[PDB]
Design a protein around this motif. Sequence first.
Motif, mmCIF file in Angstrom:
data_model
loop_
_atom_site.group_PDB
_atom_site.id
_atom_site.type_symbol
_atom_site.label_atom_id
_atom_site.label_comp_id
_atom_site.label_asym_id
_atom_site.label_seq_id
_atom_site.Cartn_x
_atom_site.Cartn_y
_atom_site.Cartn_z
ATOM 1 N N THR A 1 0.815 -1.225 0.039
ATOM 2 C CA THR A 1 0.213 0.050 0.031
ATOM 3 C C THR A 1 0.831 1.139 0.028
ATOM 4 O OG1 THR A 1 -1.660 -1.235 1.134
ATOM 5 C CG2 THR A 1 -1.952 1.349 0.980
ATOM 6 N N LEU A 2 0.586 2.149 -1.000
ATOM 7 C CA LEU A 2 1.125 3.600 -1.108
ATOM 8 C C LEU A 2 0.197 4.561 -0.371
ATOM 9 C CD1 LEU A 2 2.474 3.650 -4.614
ATOM 10 C CD2 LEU A 2 4.001 3.315 -2.836
ATOM 11 N N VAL A 3 0.878 5.499 0.239
ATOM 12 C CA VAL A 3 0.143 6.688 0.685
ATOM 13 C C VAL A 3 0.531 7.948 0.120
ATOM 14 C CG1 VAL A 3 1.640 6.765 2.609
ATOM 15 C CG2 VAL A 3 -0.794 7.696 2.941
ATOM 16 N N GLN B 1 -6.266 -0.858 4.916
ATOM 17 C CA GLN B 1 -6.030 0.385 5.856
ATOM 18 C C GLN B 1 -6.900 1.326 5.396
ATOM 19 O OE1 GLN B 1 -1.708 0.650 6.548
ATOM 20 N NE2 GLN B 1 -1.454 -0.314 4.432
ATOM 21 N N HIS C 1 -6.243 0.550 10.621
ATOM 22 C CA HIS C 1 -6.098 -0.555 9.739
ATOM 23 C C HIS C 1 -7.087 -1.592 10.487
ATOM 24 C CE1 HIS C 1 -3.398 -2.258 12.935
ATOM 25 N NE2 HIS C 1 -3.200 -1.138 12.956
ATOM 26 N N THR D 1 9.687 5.185 9.460
ATOM 27 C CA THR D 1 9.223 5.565 10.801
ATOM 28 C C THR D 1 8.072 5.146 11.392
ATOM 29 O OG1 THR D 1 7.727 7.595 9.904
ATOM 30 C CG2 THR D 1 10.125 8.145 10.265
ATOM 31 N N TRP D 2 8.122 4.562 12.431
ATOM 32 C CA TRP D 2 7.198 3.998 13.179
ATOM 33 C C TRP D 2 6.514 4.953 14.182
ATOM 34 C CZ3 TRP D 2 11.416 1.587 11.642
ATOM 35 C CH2 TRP D 2 11.267 0.121 10.878
ATOM 36 N N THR E 1 1.935 -0.094 16.272
ATOM 37 C CA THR E 1 2.347 0.876 15.452
ATOM 38 C C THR E 1 1.692 1.197 14.018
ATOM 39 O OG1 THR E 1 4.045 -0.123 14.231
ATOM 40 C CG2 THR E 1 4.798 0.733 16.422
ATOM 41 N N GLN E 2 1.756 2.357 13.322
ATOM 42 C CA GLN E 2 1.506 2.431 11.967
ATOM 43 C C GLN E 2 3.088 3.068 11.576
ATOM 44 O OE1 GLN E 2 -2.649 4.144 12.832
ATOM 45 N NE2 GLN E 2 -2.554 3.070 10.829
ATOM 46 N N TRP E 3 3.287 2.626 10.343
ATOM 47 C CA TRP E 3 4.596 3.245 9.766
ATOM 48 C C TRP E 3 4.465 3.764 8.421
ATOM 49 C CZ3 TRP E 3 5.471 0.497 5.340
ATOM 50 C CH2 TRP E 3 5.200 -0.818 5.222
ATOM 51 N N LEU E 4 5.420 4.696 8.058
ATOM 52 C CA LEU E 4 5.704 5.161 6.693
ATOM 53 C C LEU E 4 7.066 4.879 6.187
ATOM 54 C CD1 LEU E 4 4.166 8.664 7.526
ATOM 55 C CD2 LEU E 4 3.115 6.924 6.229
ATOM 56 N N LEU E 5 7.193 4.192 5.098
ATOM 57 C CA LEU E 5 8.535 3.753 4.603
ATOM 58 C C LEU E 5 8.633 4.834 3.190
ATOM 59 C CD1 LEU E 5 9.777 0.537 3.732
ATOM 60 C CD2 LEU E 5 10.412 2.200 2.071
ATOM 61 N N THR E 6 9.440 5.971 3.184
ATOM 62 C CA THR E 6 9.709 6.510 2.007
ATOM 63 C C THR E 6 10.977 6.399 1.481
ATOM 64 O OG1 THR E 6 8.611 8.650 3.160
ATOM 65 C CG2 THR E 6 10.080 9.148 1.182
ATOM 66 N N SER F 1 6.402 7.360 -3.603
ATOM 67 C CA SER F 1 7.644 7.450 -2.817
ATOM 68 C C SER F 1 7.278 6.557 -1.663
ATOM 69 C CB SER F 1 8.103 8.675 -2.733
ATOM 70 O OG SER F 1 7.203 9.446 -1.770
ATOM 71 N N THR F 2 6.075 6.461 -1.101
ATOM 72 C CA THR F 2 5.897 6.017 0.369
ATOM 73 C C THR F 2 4.895 5.049 0.708
ATOM 74 O OG1 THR F 2 6.240 8.581 0.847
ATOM 75 C CG2 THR F 2 5.397 7.137 2.568
ATOM 76 N N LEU F 3 5.226 3.967 1.138
ATOM 77 C CA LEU F 3 4.517 2.793 1.633
ATOM 78 C C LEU F 3 4.127 2.979 3.134
ATOM 79 C CD1 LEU F 3 6.767 -0.175 0.736
ATOM 80 C CD2 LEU F 3 4.634 0.620 -0.554
ATOM 81 N N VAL F 4 3.056 2.483 3.352
ATOM 82 C CA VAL F 4 2.260 2.647 4.701
ATOM 83 C C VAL F 4 1.917 1.139 5.208
ATOM 84 C CG1 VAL F 4 -0.080 3.299 3.713
ATOM 85 C CG2 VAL F 4 0.503 3.770 6.212
ATOM 86 N N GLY F 5 2.078 1.094 6.456
ATOM 87 C CA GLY F 5 1.537 -0.144 7.155
ATOM 88 C C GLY F 5 1.626 -0.119 8.460
ATOM 89 N N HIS F 6 1.393 -1.405 9.198
ATOM 90 C CA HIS F 6 1.032 -1.306 10.520
ATOM 91 C C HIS F 6 1.822 -2.470 11.295
ATOM 92 C CE1 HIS F 6 -2.208 -4.405 9.756
ATOM 93 N NE2 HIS F 6 -2.301 -3.620 8.715
ATOM 94 N N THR G 1 5.956 11.219 13.815
ATOM 95 C CA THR G 1 7.001 10.798 12.792
ATOM 96 C C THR G 1 6.774 11.498 11.540
ATOM 97 O OG1 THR G 1 6.143 8.734 12.478
ATOM 98 C CG2 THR G 1 7.498 8.597 14.513
ATOM 99 N N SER H 1 8.200 11.186 7.658
ATOM 100 C CA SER H 1 8.923 10.245 6.843
ATOM 101 C C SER H 1 8.743 11.003 5.454
ATOM 102 C CB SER H 1 8.290 8.833 6.506
ATOM 103 O OG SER H 1 8.821 7.838 5.836
ATOM 104 N N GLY H 2 9.965 11.333 4.806
ATOM 105 C CA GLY H 2 10.187 11.881 3.481
ATOM 106 C C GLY H 2 11.345 11.727 2.897
ATOM 107 N N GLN I 1 5.521 12.929 4.515
ATOM 108 C CA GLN I 1 4.211 12.616 5.404
ATOM 109 C C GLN I 1 4.459 12.293 6.668
ATOM 110 O OE1 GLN I 1 3.441 10.352 1.550
ATOM 111 N NE2 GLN I 1 1.360 11.012 2.198
ATOM 112 N N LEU J 1 2.689 10.732 10.839
ATOM 113 C CA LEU J 1 1.875 10.036 11.682
ATOM 114 C C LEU J 1 1.796 10.691 13.131
ATOM 115 C CD1 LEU J 1 2.693 6.574 10.537
ATOM 116 C CD2 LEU J 1 0.475 7.624 9.795
#
Lengths: 123, 123, 124, 124
Positions: A113-115, B97, B117, C82-83, C97-102, C113-118, D82, D84-85, D98, D100
């Motif tokens: 999933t992208l955001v 999500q 989520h 980032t978590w 947590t939820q996280w953002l991976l750029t 550029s940016t994945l989101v997950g948990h 956090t 992330s960028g 972005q 959180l």
Amino acid sequence: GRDQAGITGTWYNQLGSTFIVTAGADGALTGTYESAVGNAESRYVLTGRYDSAPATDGSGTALGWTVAWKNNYRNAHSATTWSGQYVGGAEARINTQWLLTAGTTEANAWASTLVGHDTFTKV
Amino acid sequence: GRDQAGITGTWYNQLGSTFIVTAGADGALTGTYESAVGNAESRYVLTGRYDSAPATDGSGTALGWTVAWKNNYRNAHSATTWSGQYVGGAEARINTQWLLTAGTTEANAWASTLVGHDTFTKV
Amino acid sequence: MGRDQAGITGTWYNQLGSTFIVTAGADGALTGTYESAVGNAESRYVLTGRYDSAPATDGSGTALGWTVAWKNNYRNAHSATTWSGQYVGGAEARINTQWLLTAGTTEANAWASTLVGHDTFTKV
Amino acid sequence: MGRDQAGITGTWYNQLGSTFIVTAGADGALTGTYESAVGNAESRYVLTGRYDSAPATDGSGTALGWTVAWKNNYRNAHSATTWSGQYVGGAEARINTQWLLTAGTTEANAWASTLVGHDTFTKV
Ligand SMILES: O=C(CCCC[C@@H]1SC[C@@H]2NC(=O)N[C@@H]21)N[C@@H]1CC(=O)[C@H](c2cc(CS)cc(CS)c2)C1=O
Ligand SMILES: O=C(CCCC[C@@H]1SC[C@@H]2NC(=O)N[C@@H]21)N[C@@H]1CC(=O)[C@H](c2cc(CS)cc(CS)c2)C1=O
Ligand SMILES: O=C(CCCC[C@@H]1SC[C@@H]2NC(=O)N[C@@H]21)N[C@@H]1CC(=O)[C@H](c2cc(CS)cc(CS)c2)C1=O
Ligand SMILES: O=C(CCCC[C@@H]1SC[C@@H]2NC(=O)N[C@@H]21)N[C@@H]1CC(=O)[C@H](c2cc(CS)cc(CS)c2)C1=O
């Protein structure tokens, strides 16, 4: 719908994508989306919902919609949802954040999933 | 639709919310959502989209839908979008999500949107 | 001195099988290493972050976050996660947590550029 | 030694009028203070994070992230953000993020714990 007239029509985001939507009195959003980026070409069906009776305190109008990235030309095995609000006035805007999920194996679902965020204007 | 039968029906998430959806052959999702939490009661309209012709490599089926939190009982001036994938087999799941945006003033728009989520199962 | 300094400090594992080893300081600091079970990652990476060292005493969790840049002495995945989450104490302690991976991208590709997950971390 | 150590280090401002002051280390560290123009915040808060100290040389940005826990000597908002960028250099340098923001909540309210948003930082 309070903002039925404000929402209905053609919108463009910062990527040069084009969103054409009809707002119904009942809260419905129906139309087409055309992305200027990614594994996409021509128009895709969109459906969504909006608050047809928003507050009158200066707050925006909540809405969202979905596009599944399959049309008669292409299938990107993915779907985006935009969640946001419509803001009226001199210069109307729909400010959104979105989630794009691709179909993945179980092992790869962590990276499904992208955001991101799109801002739509009428010009 | 490949997973038209798999998707159609009643789903429950980890909060005890209930999602009832019909998948159409054309990619449409229509139904009702009932949240067990938040400023919500009874059912709300939902609409969305799914990939009606997914890959056959073991990957899940991308989908999304929207609920605007207005029905005949209540209006929470907000909308949620779920983005995710359907996974079939012995134990079917929709892993999502979501983004929940409330209508806000311009000054408060930075704090308009919750993210979370939900995992849906049939039991 | 941090209310949950002893609760947070230690080794945590998530649902992917990744391992998070962290020391919480009295002042709100988090320092440690992360080892991912997935992705373009091998061995341990530095992490740093922050937590609420004086949380509410009302049943609420303890807010925290941390960052990992995915460069170490073995490999570079040109990306950072980032978590953001909270620690919840007790019998079955958890960091939810939820996280953002750029990833670093060109301008043209920055929309992607940016994945989101948990991730949910437990001690066992 | 970090490729963008000099580019990143310094004072940044976002679209809300918040101020981010950061030192980038050769080893990938980010350290500094954040001052928010909005929310339950006053004065400066500690931040720590990480960046890719050896990025690609192909037009791609430089991945990074950081955390602020919203407790200082003035106030505690029982929450952490956090970001992330990526950093994008040049005439008009930018850090596009972005974020959180997780508050400590009860178990029952944890579905509503986390805000998401996006900040763009510039030098002017
Ligand atoms: O590309 C797509 C579908 C188009 C999505 C466009 C998004 S909706 C949010 C944002 N707002 C807009 O107005 N436009 C963008 N899916 C996935 C995502 C992706 O990266 C991917 C993809 C695959 C491949 C082959 S492996 C190549 C490319 C580069 S064209 C993209 C997809 O196949
Ligand atoms: O509460 C709502 C609408 C219900 C949303 C339920 C969500 S959809 C994602 C997740 N998945 C589920 O199956 N259920 C939850 N809106 C907003 C959000 C919120 O916190 C807020 C609210 C306002 C007030 C009065 S100021 C009080 C409360 C506590 S009831 C909530 C809303 O008024
Ligand atoms: O893979 C990485 C670094 C590892 C990130 C692991 C994440 S942190 C959130 C979650 N929680 C965990 O405990 N583990 C996962 N970056 C990016 C992301 C990605 O998809 C990507 C990638 C690139 C390539 C070649 S360019 C191949 C693969 C598959 S190995 C992944 C990256 O190169
Ligand atoms: O307010 C805070 C801390 C400040 C966060 C500022 C964010 S970081 C992402 C974005 N980027 C910036 O440069 N600034 C904003 N926490 C939480 C969030 C919130 O809504 C909340 C809050 C509580 C109360 C009383 S309980 C009142 C208000 C309005 S002052 C906000 C918090 O107490």
